[PDB]
Each structure stands twice: as structure tokens, then as C-alpha cells.
Amino acid sequence: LWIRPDAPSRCTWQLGRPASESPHHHTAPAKSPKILPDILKKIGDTPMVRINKIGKKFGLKCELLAKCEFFNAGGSVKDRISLRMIEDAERDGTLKPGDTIIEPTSGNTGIGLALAAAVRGYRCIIVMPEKMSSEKVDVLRALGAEIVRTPTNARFDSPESHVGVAWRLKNEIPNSHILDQYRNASNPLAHYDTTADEILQQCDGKLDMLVASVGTGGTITGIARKLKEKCPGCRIIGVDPEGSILAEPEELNQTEQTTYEVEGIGYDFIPTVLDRTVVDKWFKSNDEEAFTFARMLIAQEGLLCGGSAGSTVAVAVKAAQELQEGQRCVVILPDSVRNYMTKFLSDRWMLQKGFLKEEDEKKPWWWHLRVQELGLSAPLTVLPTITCGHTIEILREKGFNQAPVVDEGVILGMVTLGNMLSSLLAGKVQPSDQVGKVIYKQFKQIRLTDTLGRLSHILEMDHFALVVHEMVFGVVTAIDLLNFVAAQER
Amino acid sequence: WIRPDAPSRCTWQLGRPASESPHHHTAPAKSPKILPDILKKIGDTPMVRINKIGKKFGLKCELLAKCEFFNAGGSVKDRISLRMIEDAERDGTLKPGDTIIEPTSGNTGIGLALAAAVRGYRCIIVMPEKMSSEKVDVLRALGAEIVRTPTNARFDSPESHVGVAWRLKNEIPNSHILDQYRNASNPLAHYDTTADEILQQCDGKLDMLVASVGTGGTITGIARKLKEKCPGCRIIGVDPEGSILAEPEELNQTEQTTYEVEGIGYDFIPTVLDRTVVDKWFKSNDEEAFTFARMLIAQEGLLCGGSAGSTVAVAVKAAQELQEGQRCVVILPDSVRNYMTKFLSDRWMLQKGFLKEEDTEKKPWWWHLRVQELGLSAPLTVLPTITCGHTIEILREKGFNQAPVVEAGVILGMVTLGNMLSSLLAGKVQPSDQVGKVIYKQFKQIRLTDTLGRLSHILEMDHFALVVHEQMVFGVVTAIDLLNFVAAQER
Numbered sequence: 001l002w003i004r005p006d007a008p009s010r011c012t013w014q015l016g017r018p019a020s021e022s023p024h025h026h027t028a029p030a031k032s033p034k035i036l037p038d039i040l041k042k043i044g045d046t047p048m049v050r051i052n053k054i055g056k057k058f059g060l061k062c063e064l065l066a067k068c069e070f071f072n073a074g075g076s077v078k079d080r081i082s083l084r085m086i087e088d089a090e091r092d093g094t095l096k097p098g099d100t101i102i103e104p105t106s107g108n109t110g111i112g113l114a115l116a117a118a119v120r121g122y123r124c125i126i127v128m129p130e131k132m133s134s135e136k137v138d139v140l141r142a143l144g145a146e147i148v149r150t151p152t153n154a155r156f157d158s159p160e161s162h163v164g165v166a167w168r169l170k171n172e173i174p175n176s177h178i179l180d181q182y183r184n185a186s187n188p189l190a191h192y193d194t195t196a197d198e199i200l201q202q203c204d205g206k207l208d209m210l211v212a213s214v215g216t217g218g219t220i221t222g223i224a225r226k227l228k229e230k231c232p233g234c235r236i237i238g239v240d241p242e243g244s245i246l247a248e249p250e251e252l253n254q255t256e257q258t259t260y261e262v263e264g265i266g267y268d269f270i271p272t273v274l275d276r277t278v279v280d281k282w283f284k285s286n287d288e289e290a291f292t293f294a295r296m297l298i299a300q301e302g303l304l305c306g307g308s309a310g311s312t313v314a315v316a317v318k319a320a321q322e323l324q325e326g327q328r329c330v331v332i333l334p335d336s337v338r339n340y341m342t343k344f345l346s347d348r349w350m351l352q353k354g355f356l357k358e359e360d361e362k363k364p365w366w367w368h369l370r371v372q373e374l375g376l377s378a379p380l381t382v383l384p385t386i387t388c389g390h391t392i393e394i395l396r397e398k399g400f401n402q403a404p405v406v407d408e409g410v411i412l413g414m415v416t417l418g419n420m421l422s423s424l425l426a427g428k429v430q431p432s433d434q435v436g437k438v439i440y441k442q443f444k445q446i447r448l449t450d451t452l453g454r455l456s457h458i459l460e461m462d463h464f465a466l467v468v469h470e471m472v473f474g475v476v477t478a479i480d481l482l483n484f485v486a487a488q489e490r
Numbered sequence: 491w492i493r494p495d496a497p498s499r500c501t502w503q504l505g506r507p508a509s510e511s512p513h514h515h516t517a518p519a520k521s522p523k524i525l526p527d528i529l530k531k532i533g534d535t536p537m538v539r540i541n542k543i544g545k546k547f548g549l550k551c552e553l554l555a556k557c558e559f560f561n562a563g564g565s566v567k568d569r570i571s572l573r574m575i576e577d578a579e580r581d582g583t584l585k586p587g588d589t590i591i592e593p594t595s596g597n598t599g600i601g602l603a604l605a606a607a608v609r610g611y612r613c614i615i616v617m618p619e620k621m622s623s624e625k626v627d628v629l630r631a632l633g634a635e636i637v638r639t640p641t642n643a644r645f646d647s648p649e650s651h652v653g654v655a656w657r658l659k660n661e662i663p664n665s666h667i668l669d670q671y672r673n674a675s676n677p678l679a680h681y682d683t684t685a686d687e688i689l690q691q692c693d694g695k696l697d698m699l700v701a702s703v704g705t706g707g708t709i710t711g712i713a714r715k716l717k718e719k720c721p722g723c724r725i726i727g728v729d730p731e732g733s734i735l736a737e738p739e740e741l742n743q744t745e746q747t748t749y750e751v752e753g754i755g756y757d758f759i760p761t762v763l764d765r766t767v768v769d770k771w772f773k774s775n776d777e778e779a780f781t782f783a784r785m786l787i788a789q790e791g792l793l794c795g796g797s798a799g800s801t802v803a804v805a806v807k808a809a810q811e812l813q814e815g816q817r818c819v820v821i822l823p824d825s826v827r828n829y830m831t832k833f834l835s836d837r838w839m840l841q842k843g844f845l846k847e848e849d850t851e852k853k854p855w856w857w858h859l860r861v862q863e864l865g866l867s868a869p870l871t872v873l874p875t876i877t878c879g880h881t882i883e884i885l886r887e888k889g890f891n892q893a894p895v896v897e898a899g900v901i902l903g904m905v906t907l908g909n910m911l912s913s914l915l916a917g918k919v920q921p922s923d924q925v926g927k928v929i930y931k932q933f934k935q936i937r938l939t940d941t942l943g944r945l946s947h948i949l950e951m952d953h954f955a956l957v958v959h960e961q962m963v964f965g966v967v968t969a970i971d972l973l974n975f976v977a978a979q980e981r
């Protein structure tokens with residue numbers, strides 16, 4: 001017992017077949033009630049938002065639209081296929097109450113399934129590649145799903161693959177089923193019945209082009225089939241990452257790299273649910289395009305979305321160049337920034353992985369300069385063992401507003417006149433009390449030879465930044481940096 | 491400098507006609523098929539029923555949740571940020587290209603940075619250093635400049651986020667502080683929109699509403715309109731231990747000053763907070779909050795923040811008096827996104843001591859056992875520099891499925907028979923090619939004296955877990971093996 005995820009499709013559908021000839025149970029989109037019975041009803045009806053800036057930055061004549069799927073309950077487009085697959089299984093009588101659900105996944109399907117299982121009371125085991133983000137793990141574990149990892153770069157054939165291991169676990173566990181998002185008709189059917197109807201209804205039937213990145217392929221297949229039926233003039237454009245085999249012709253697929261950073265799209269095999277015949281043209285994207293463009297979606301359009309979305313738009317600005325005014329282009333945005341918090345959203349990760357060259361220029365004049373250009377003054381020291389009011393006496397008598405608290409030489413912190421006074425007036429501290437009650441413990445250290453941009457970073461975390469010997473030579477805050485930049489401004 | 495705690499000059503009192511109001515009120519509008527921009531995605535948040543947690547705690551009544559984490563920025567603050575901007579723009583106070591500086595818990599900061607991103611305003615955000623870094627990352631990605639202020643810095647002191655905000659405002663031309671603490675737009679947002687949604691969704695029938703308290707705009711704005719159109723509804727506020735907002739003052743007497751839950755509570759009474767429309771107050775703590783937020787997640791499938799957890803934690807107490815046919819609506823402010831590495835993280839919960847290791851009790855029988863109890867066997871080792879087909883030969887010859895690739899004796903990784911064969915059959919590698927092409931580089935090491943449950947954790951990150959001594963490998967374990975053992979011990 002193992003079923004091939006790459007096994008060729010037995011589906012007899014082809015363009016022009018009546019909705020009557022279909023053997024499948026179709027679900028019509030329904031109105032949402034005033035009060036939702038459970039969170040699973042919050043899946044679907046995702047908004048179609050206009051891309052106002054990015055489209056014109058690249059000179060698109062057409063209308064650039066984005067179907068934002070990260071507004072689903074689990075926060076990904078996978079929440080759709082997870083509910084549907086479950087619901088249908090329940091109708092088959094295959095999925096029984098208290099039963100175990102096992103799935104191989106990029107993790108979005110895993111999160112949608114763990115969510116639905118949490119609500120409906122199913123045990124859920126998720127098998128995902130080791131590449132996938134820990135944020136996904138935190139969300140899954142929080143939903144109460146059991147988690148197994150498989151090595152990325154492990155062939156889909158090998159016993160170590162996520163699909164293979166999923167099956168090996170299914171065989172060893174009683175009442176355990178694999179819904180199999182790669183072979184399940186529910187995956188593309190979810191999109192055929194719901195997502196496509198939504199895209200059409202929202203656009204009033206008028207649609208020139210659709211751009212979608214490709215995972216298992218249920219999204220692009222499901223959408224494209226119904227689009228080819230109800231809006232045949234629409235060009236279907238698929239997006240495949242460099243290193244995958246999904247794109248046509250095979251020539252586009254020839255590549256050096258095997259594994260890549262972008263999560264959720266591309267595979268080393270051709271999924272059953274994937275119908276490559278309805279994709280009019282394919283495009284290859286890379287990790288850099290994806291992360292640059294995703295960050296661009298966030299900063300420009302204010303859409304908090306994942307990397308695959310970035311690939312999708314990155315290709316969209318190219319593929320939609322042919323189009324001209326009055327025509328519209330729809331883009332699929334699969335998931336949210338939540339999964340990627342410590343990866344592409346993090347600057348340090350972008351650097352460490354070499355996507356952001358430090359060269360890539362946009363920063364102001366003051367960015368490169370020494371802190372020494374600021375004009376500081378060495379503040380008075382003090383012991384942690386001093387008493388509050390006494391420090392007031394020293395501060396006013398020396399005419400200082402703040403002192404760094406240094407140890408019998410470990411810098412312990414900072415105490416300021418204003419917070420001392422404020423703390424006393426509220427009765428929060430006594431003049432006989434230890435200074436450690438009101439002390440500011442958190443600060444960061446800098447060299448006089450450090451750059452102003454470094455300081456700009458440090459001040460995004462801490463309020464105080466002390467310039468110190470390689471002995472405090474000065475205390476710097478954002479306000480000082482402002483006083484400098486603005487003084488040098490006029 | 492204007493005080494955020496200055497008492498309200500508002501002449502509103504219950505029973506005043508809406509005609510007497512000096513304010514411009516904005517009615518909720520129908521969303522078009524295509525949204526002009528994402529800011530139109532703020533509001534119309536779903537009302538979801540709480541099916542499990544309410545009954546577990548024995549509520550006879552209907553427990554409803556207003557999920558505010560579905561807003562564009564992902565918090566209830568996205569509402570006050572748009573509103574505060576729009577009114578300012580209508581005032582002519584806010585001009586294009588101007589700078590907006592705001593003190594915030596960071597959700598207001600995110601809604602404002604988002605709105606600034608769409609409408610093209612420079613955005614400077616001032617937040618306490620306590621607040622989560624996820625917020626910093628989202629803000630920075632949105633193109634906002636970030637300034638931090640020491641937590642425990644009194645709201646009066648110049649080092650406070652409000653004070654620093656003002657000092658920034660004074661030194662920068664064309665810079666405005668929209669001031670969520672004094673701005674009428676904040677509670678008006680909730681009066682006009684949030685409360686209308688709550689009413690329409692509940693069909694005017696509402697017995698109780700529970701809401702946590704930040705600046706106080708949510709509860710104030712909701713409560714005013716609720717007292718007007720649904721007088722039977724009780725307003726219940728939630729304040730964290732260490733805050734001064736709750737009434738009477740007796741509730742506020744406490745040891746601690748600062749707390750872990752983000753977004754709620756303050757050391758001052760904001761102008762926008764109307765404490766007269768709050769029928770009763772409740773004090774909450776961090777443990778209650780995180781326990782209940784995690785509970786919302788695991789039970790209800792609502793991915794929400796800590797304040798939501800506080801709100802529900804109080805809700806299960808305050809709503810006991812209610813009985814069947816009555817409903818209680820709860821405000822769930824924001825999402826798990828800001829808290830990814832904090833309360834959602836088990837290690838952080840342990841490190842801060844919210845998850846006692848006692849509450850090991852819920853875990854199965856095999857959980858406390860030694861890993862060595864699995865019955866392993868030290869596998870054959872190979873060089874990283876060995877050749878593919880050779881490894882195939884040794885592997886078949888000894889009947890091993892895999893060999894750890896380890897001279898210095900540091901384990902470099904893992905090689906398996908099936909993946910090699912598959913790799914060759916696909917033509918990705920030659921029989922003469924080196925093992926490094928197909929090697930699995932990522933693995934983790936465990937001790938024989940570690941628990942099986944620890945291993946269960948390890949297997950959530952990695953596929954291979956090698957049992958080694960302090961670098962001699964005595965065995966290789968995957969999740970499948972742990973399963974084989976437990977299930978063997980089951981028959």
C-alpha cells in the first residue's frame with residue numbers, strides 16, 4: 001500500500017463538457033449568516049483588492065487585481081481544500097468521528113487541517129519537509145496536531161519523503177486516513193466551485209488574465225477549468241519556481257539548483273490533481289524575485305502576504321505587459337506573512353541568505369557617518385546601592401538630567417531625574433529606597449567608531465544606546481540622532 | 491505637551507439625542523465587488539460562536555466572539571488608525587507627505603503604518619521595549635521608523651513613549667501626533683462601526699459585552715451606543731493586574747507594576763476612556779490570559795492574541811449570572827501574529843514559568859521512559875567521501891537501510907538506500923558520484939537518558955534523531971521507530 005502522488009489523472013473532463021456529465025458533487029457558494037456557528041465558516045469570500053502602485057511602477061497598462069487568500073481562517077488558501085476534503089470524506093462515510101487524519105504538506109494544508117480537526121474533533125498528524133518554517137510548527141503544535149518532519153531534497157519516491165512517510169504512518173495506525181491533497185478531487189473542486197465563482201462574480205465576468213503560482217496545482221487547475229468554461233478569452237498563466245519540474249516546455253525546467261527558500265510552490269513530481277493542459281503559459285521565478293516583490297507588496301500595497309504571493313506578482317508584472325488599458329489581470333495571493341516572520345520579513349535572514357546585498361543606496365545622507373559626529377557629553381556615574389533621593393541631590397546639584405548606573409564597572413543601567421521625580425510624586429518609591437527599583441535596565445552599547453545606521457537599527461529595539469570604550473563616553477537616544485540630522489538639515 | 495490623562499471635555503450623557511452631537515458620524519457602507527485599496531478591508535469582522543470553552547466552564551448562555559484579528563493589519567487598531575487619519579484629512583490638519591508620529595502598544599502603530607503605506611505618509615512609531623519584536627518586523631516591513639522607550643518609565647517622565655512622541659513632534663516640521671489617547675476618532679470609530687456590527691449581528695438582542703481595556707476606545711465607543719440602542723446589555727471591562735484603570739480603586743491595589751500581556755492596561759487614565767459607561771470591572775493576570783488564549787486556539791480554532799485570552803478568561807467568570815437564551819459577546823482584539831515567539835512558544839511559556847511542567851500529566855504512559863529503552867543497534871558508519879554505489883553495496887551486504895555519514899568523528903549527516911537508488915534511477919547522480927549529492931545534512935542528537943517525549947519534541951523539528959554519547963552513535967531514530975516501539979508495547 002502506497003499510492004503515487006504523480007500517478008496520471010483518470011479525469012474525463014475536457015473543455016465543452018456539460019455540468020450534467022460530471023460525476024462529482026458540486027457545492028454552490030452560500031450566504032454567510034449573521035452569527036457564525038464555527039470558525040470554519042470564515043473560509044472563502046476572500047476580497048479582491050486593487051493593486052494601486054506596483055502595477056504602474058512596472059508600466060502595466062491593464063488593471064492589476066489581487067485575490068487575497070490570506071484572510072481565510074487558517075490564514076492560507078489551503079483552508080479551502082482542507083475543509084472541503086474533510087467534508088466530502090465525511091459524506092463518503094470514510095471519515096468517522098474521533099478518527100485520525102494524516103497529511104503530507106507544505107504546511108498550509110497542514111494548518112487548515114489541524115484547524116478543522118481542532119474544531120470538529122479529529123486527531124491530526126502532519127508530515128512536512130524540514131525546510132518549512134518553524135512558525136508553521138508553532139501554529140500546528142498550538143492547534144494540537146502531532147508533527148513529523150522529513151528531509152527536504154529527499155526524493156518523493158524514497159521512503160523518507162513526506163508523502164512516503166505519510167503512508168508508512170497510515171499503515172501502522174488504526175483508523176488513520178490520508179485525504180491526499182495531491183490526488184483528491186476535492187482539492188481542485190474546492191476552487192472550481194468556490195474560488196472561481198468568487199473571482200468571476202467579483203469581476204462581473206470580465207477577466208483578461210489570471211496569474212497563479214503552483215503547488216499541488218489544485219488552485220490553478222480548478223480555477224482555469226471553470227474560467228475556460230465561463231470566460232474562455234482569459235489567459236491562464238502559471239508560475240513555477242526555479243528548481244521545479246512543473247513548467248512547460250521541459251526546456252524551462254533545466255536548472256542547477258534543487259532546493260530553494262520559497263515555501264509552498266513547486267515539486268519534483270507532477271501531481272495528479274494538476275492539469276497542465278489548461279495553463280496557457282508558464283513562467284519561472286526565483287527566491288530573490290519572490291522575497292523582493294513580497295516585501296514590495298507589503299511596503300507598497302500594504303498587503304501582508306507570503307513569498308509565493310511575491311513570486312506570483314513578480315511574474316505578473318512581466319506576463320501582463322502585453323495587456324493594454326481596460327483589460328484586467330487577477331493575481332492569486334496564497335498565504336500571509338505570519339508563516340515567514342523570522343525568514344523573509346527579517347532583515348538579518350535576508351542578509352545571511354544573501355538576498356539583500358548591503359549595497360542595495362536607498363538610505364539617507366547621514367546613514368554612513370560616525371557617532372562621534374553627534375557632540376555628546378560624559379555623564380556622571382553612580383552605584384546601584386545609592387538611594388533615590390540622594391541621586392536627585394547629585395543630579396540637580398551637578399545640573400545633569402540622567403546618569404548611567406555603573407557597578408563597583410559593569411554597566412547596570414540608567415536613572416533619569418524625570419522618572420525619579422515622577423516615581424516619588426506617585427509614591428511608587430521612597431527617598432530611602434534602592435535606585436534599582438526605578439532603574440532602566442535595558443540598553444545597548446556602541447563604539448565611537450560605529451556607524452549612524454547601526455545606531456538607527458539599535459534604536460528600533462532599545463531606547464538608550466551608550467557609546468563606550470573598547471567607561472561611558474556618552475548616552476545617545478533617537479532624539480539626539482534627530483537633533484543632529486535636523487541641525488545639519490538647515 | 492498635552493496630557494493623555496486629561497479629563498474629557500465631552501458633554502455626552504445618556505439620553506441625549508444624536509442630533510445634539512457636535513461630531514461627524516460615519517455610517518458603515520457596502521463594500522464594492524473590487525476594493526480600491528486594502529484599507530476598505532477594515533470592519534465587517536465576523537461574529538463567531540464559542541462552542542467549547544463556554545460549556546467547559548458551565549456557561550448556560552450563548553458565548554459569542556467578535557473577531558477583530560481579521561482586519562487588514564490584523565488588530566482592532568486598524569479601525570481607529572483609518573478613522574483617526576480620515577477625520578484629520580477632513581480637518582485639513584493632515585496634508586499629503588506629512589509625518590505621523592504615534593505612541594503605541596504597536597497595534598495602533600501597525601494600523602497607522604499600514605494606512606501611511608497606502609496613503610503616502612511618513613510614519614514614526616514610538617513603542618515600549620517590552621512589546622514583541624514581531625511587531626517591530628511588521629512595522630519595519632511597512633516602512634515605519636521605530637523608536638523604543640523603557641517600560642516602567644512613568645507616563646509623565648520624558649522617557650515614556652508619549653513624552654518621547656511629543657519631543658519628536660516638536661523637533662520635526664509638518665509632524666502630527668494623531669494621539670489615540672485624546673482623539674475622539676478612536677471611540678467614535680467603535681461607536682459608529684463596531685457597535686453597529688455587534689447590534690446587527692445579534693439582531694439587537696444582547697445581554698452582556700466583555701472587553702479588555704487599552705486606551706479605552708473599544709469599550710467606551712461600544713458601550714455608549716449599546717446603552718443607547720440596547721440598554722439591557724451589561725458593560726464589562728477587563729484590566730490587567732498592575733494597571734490603574736479598574737474601578738473601584740480597591741481592585742487596583744497590587745504588588746507588581748509591569749505585566750507580560752500586550753495592548754491592555756496603563757499607568758494613567760486616557761481621555762477617551764469613559765469609565766461611567768462601564769458597569770463592572772475585572773482584574774486579570776498573565777497566566778489566565780495565556781492559558782485562555784491558547785485555549786481559544788486549541789479548542790475554538792481562533793488564532794488570537796493574549797488580550798483576547800484575558801477577555802475570555804474574565805468572560806467565563808462574569809457571564810455565570812446569565813442563563814439560557816441570553817448571549818454574551820466578547821471582543822477579541824488581535825491575532826497570534828504579534829505573539830509568535832512569545833505565548834505561542836512553549837519554551838517561552840516555560841522560561842517565563844507560565845507552563846509548569848506538572849500540568850507532563852496530560853501526556854501518555856510512554857512519555858517518561860528512557861530513550862535507550864527503545865532497543866536500538868549501533869549502525870554501520872561510512873565516510874562522506876565514499877562513493878554512491880559502494881555504499882549501496884555495503885548497505886545491501888549488511889542489510890542496513892541507512893548509514894550515518896560521520897574521520898574526526900563528527901557526524902556530517904545521513905545516507906539512505908532508497909533515496910540513493912531513487913536518485914540514480916532518476917539520473918540525478920552517477921554510481922561513481924560522491925555521497926554529498928544525496929546526503930541529508932540536517933539531523934539532531936539525543937542522549938539515552940533523555941525522555942521519549944523529549945524525543946517527540948525533537949522529531950517535530952527533524953526527521954533523524956541520533957542517539958550518541960558525549961560522538962559515538964549507538965542508534966538512529968525517526969518518528970516511525972518511536973511508533974513501532976509504542977505500538978509493540980501496546981500488543
Ligand code: HEM
Pocket residue numbers: 008009010011012013014017018019021022023024183184185186188189190192221222225272273
Ligand atoms: C465535466 C465534468 C467532469 C467529469 C465528467 C469528470 C470525470 C471524472 C471521473 C469519472 C473521474 C474518476 C476516474 C476513475 O477513477 O476512473 C475523475 C477524476 C478526477 N477528477 Fe474529474 N470529472 C469532471 C470534472 C472535474 C473537475 C472540473 C475537476 C477539478 C476541479 C476534477 C477533478 C478530478 C480529480 C482531482 C480526479 C482524480 C482521479 C484519479 O484518481 O485519477 N474533475 N473525473
Ligand code: HEM
Pocket residue numbers: 496497498499500501502503506507508509510511512513672673674675677678679680681710711714761762
Ligand atoms: C450627543 C452626544 C455627544 C455630544 C453632545 C458630545 C459633545 C462633545 C463636545 C462639545 C466635546 C468638546 C470637544 C473639545 O473640547 O475639543 C466632546 C469631546 C469628546 N467626545 Fe463627545 N459628544 C457626544 C458623543 C460622543 C461619543 C458617542 C463619543 C465616543 C464614542 C465621544 C467622544 C469624545 C471624545 C473622545 C472627546 C475629547 C474630549 C477632550 O478633549 O478631552 N463623544 N464631545
Ligand SMILES: *Cc1c(COP(=O)(O)O)cnc(C)c1O
Pocket residue numbers: 076078106107108109213214215216217218219220263264265306308309334335
Ligand atoms: C499550496 C500553496 C500554494 C500553491 O497552491 P496550489 O493550489 O497547490 O497550486 C502557493 N503558496 C502557498 C504558501 C501554498 O501553501
Ligand SMILES: *Cc1c(COP(=O)(O)O)cnc(C)c1O
Pocket residue numbers: 565567595596597598702703704705706707708709752753754795797798823824
Ligand atoms: C489597543 C488594544 C487593546 C485595547 O483596546 P482599547 O480600545 O484601547 O480599549 C486590546 N488588545 C490589543 C492587542 C490592543 O492592541
